Write a protein that binds this ligand. Structure first.
Ligand SMILES: CC(=O)N[C@@H]1[C@@H](O)[C@H](O)[C@@H](CO)O[C@H]1O
Ligand SMILES: [Ca+2]
Length: 402
């Protein structure tokens, strides 16, 4: 069969000490590459993988996805939240890594900024999955912005440094991705800032989504992302508006990744399953209400129902689900999986006092045919959905037939 390595793990009863962040409770671990006793993913199948975390702090936290090869540690970008006010904050980050057999990948905390919430109210997650195995028409990039000076107001955000870009599809001299291989792409970013920042994602000259985060002095991470089916020559890029700050503190970086999931014309079209939907309704949510994302950007194979907000599995398999929510107050959402009655997988909470925020969560889930996945509101219901402060829910099948 084709290789299907993919995992998600959360914290519940983590072992104590060291700077490796151990996610002790496994949600998904197909081919068991993840070691919950150590917090380390081990590569068996060489290739390009995507790794991401969404970790809850109440104080100061700085985290970095670290890898090793032949036992030698390879340090990398960091992501921090230093709000430091006692309220829940989600720090997030992610990147593509090209790995060889035996390489390991993990999340490390800064020993001086290492606060991670411990308790039952909300969750922290680490996930990863193979994008394509090594050894052929692919597209993948992770780029970063290696400068201390922020973008100009109302301009395209250039990411000048490359972590991986084997097809040259992101051009660091123009700041744009240009499609060579037509098909369905995932695009995602995590940008560090210490003043207000809105990031806009553009496709062929049209603004697709915008996410904003406000801060004064302390460091936070603005995240966003979307699935788009692109044709040859189409351009995608990120931009800022009047809120342009990308000045991270030491140890907090900015990354933009993208990768082709489903090439057009590569067969088993019914298996190309991907949706991205935004919420344009701002009626107050009540506790236990399914959160409807009414506006469809992408819905390949029509497994997402915008009238309900639920995804329903037709092709059993491994899926990655993700969301980014704008908000002006305290927000907790339950990620639900089940049939008639669904059960909570995790709760993500992210608090905000007298400000604007963008939070995110994601999870790899194995689904059987007929199971539903959706987001469910709680008593902490400050969720905002509008042009210039979007809320989006997305999901995609990881391993369609070759
Ligand atoms: C399903 C499974 O294997 N769960 C184990 C659990 O029994 C053990 O307590 C924990 C140690 O932190 O590691 C988890 O992987
Ligand atoms: Ca927050």
């Amino acid at each position: 069969d084709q290789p299907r390595p993919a995992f998600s793990a959360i914290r519940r009863n983590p072992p104590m000490g060291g700077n490796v962040v151990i996610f002790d409770t496994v949600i998904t671990n197909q081919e068991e590459p993840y070691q919950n006793h150590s917090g380390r993913f081990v590569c068996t199948v060489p290739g390009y993988y995507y790794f991401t975390f969404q970790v809850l702090s109440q104080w100061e936290i700085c985290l970095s996805i670290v890898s090793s090869s032949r036992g030698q540690v390879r340090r990398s970008l960091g992501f921090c939240d230093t709000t430091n006010k006692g309220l829940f904050q989600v720090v997030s980050g992610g990147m593509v890594l090209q790995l060889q057999q035996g390489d390991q990948v993990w999340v490390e905390k800064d020993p001086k900024k290492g606060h991670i919430y411990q308790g039952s109210e909300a969750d922290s997650v680490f996930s990863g999955f193979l994008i394509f195995p090594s050894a052929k028409f692919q597209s993948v990039f992770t780029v970063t912005r290696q400068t201390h000076q922020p973008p100009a107001p109302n301009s395209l955000i250039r990411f000048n440094a490359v972590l991986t870009n084997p097809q040259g599809d992101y051009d660091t001299s123009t700041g744009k991705f240009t499609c060579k291989v037509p098909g369905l792409y995932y695009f995602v970013y995590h940008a560090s800032h210490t003043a207000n920042l809105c990031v806009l994602l553009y496709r062929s000259g049209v603004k697709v989504v915008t996410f904003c985060g406000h801060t004064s002095k302390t460091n936070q991470v603005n995240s966003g992302g979307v699935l788009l089916r692109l044709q040859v020559g189409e351009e995608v890029w990120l931009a800022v508006n009047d809120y342009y700050d990308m000045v991270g503190i030491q140890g907090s970086d900015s990354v933009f990744s993208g990768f082709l999931l489903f090439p057009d014309g590569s067969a088993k079209a019914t298996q190309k399953i991907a949706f991205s939907a935004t919420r344009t309704i701002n009626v107050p949510l009540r506790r236990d209400q399914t959160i409807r994302f009414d506006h469809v950007i992408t819905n390949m194979n029509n497994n997402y129902e915008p009238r309900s907000g639920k995804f329903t599995c037709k092709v059993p398999g491994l899926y990655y689900f993700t969301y980014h929510a704008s908000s002006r107050g305290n927000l907790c959402v339950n990620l639900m999986r089940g049939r008639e009655r669904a059960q909570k997988v995790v709760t993500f909470c992210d608090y905000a006092y007298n400000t604007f925020q963008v939070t995110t969560g994601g999870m790899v889930l194995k689904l059987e045919q007929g199971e539903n996945v959706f987001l469910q509101a709680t008593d902490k219901n400050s969720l905002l959905g509008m042009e210039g402060a979007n809320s989006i829910f997305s999901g995609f099948l990881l391993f369609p037939d070759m």
